[PDB]
Each structure stands twice: as C-alpha cells, then as structure tokens.
C-alpha cells in the first residue's frame, strides 16, 4: 500500500538534517566453480 503521506518540509528537512520469494541469485557448479543453468538445476 502506498503510504501517500502529505508533504511537510518541517519534518522533511529535519529528517534530512523487499518481499521477495524464490531462488533469486544465480548459483554455480560447486565441483568446478562454473555457472549452473536452470535446465539442470534439479538433478545436480
């Protein structure tokens, strides 16, 4: 939900003064330090 807070400089200047899911990053072949492919990502 966007917070949609109203603009206020008295608070803004004074202050100035991620729900991911799944296998995000790429994984590598442990035996040989080589990048995996999703095709063989299961039997490995």
């Amino acid at each position: 939900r966007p917070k949609r807070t109203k603009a206020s400089m008295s608070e803004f200047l004074e202050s100035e003064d991620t729900y991911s899911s799944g296998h995000n990053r790429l994984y590598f072949h442990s035996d040989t330090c080589l990048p995996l492919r999703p095709q063989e990502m299961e039997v490995d």
């Binding site: 296998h23 990053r25 790429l26 994984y27 590598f28 072949h29 442990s30």
Partner: protein, 58 residues
C-alpha cells in the same frame, strides 16, 4: 536424543533405525547421519563475504 549418541540401528528398534536400512524415510529423526539423508544445497557468492551456501528447499 538427550544423550549425545544417535540411536544405534541395532538399538532403536521402535523407531525403525534397523528397519529398511536401504530405504531413506524412517519414523526416527535421530538416525539420519548413519543414513546420510543430506539435503540438497546451492553454492552462490554470499552477500556477507565471498562464496556462501543457499538451501534449495524449505
């Protein structure tokens, strides 16, 4: 389990430690290391420092 000893296959006959040594799934949970029911892992560059380990399954 209170002991540091894994229930020996020849002893925890009630949890099937001896039963189906060939099979992978048993009633017991403190018999795995003997059977080596390891989980599948993934190797990736860790966010913290260099290489790291990531788990494939929940």
């Amino acid at each position: 389990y209170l002991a540091v000893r894994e229930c020996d296959p020849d002893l925890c006959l009630t949890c099937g430690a001896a039963d189906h040594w060939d099979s992978k799934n048993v009633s017991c949970k403190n018999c795995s290391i003997q059977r080596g029911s390891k989980k599948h892992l993934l190797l990736a560059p860790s966010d913290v420092a260099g290489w790291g380990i990531f788990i494939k399954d929940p």
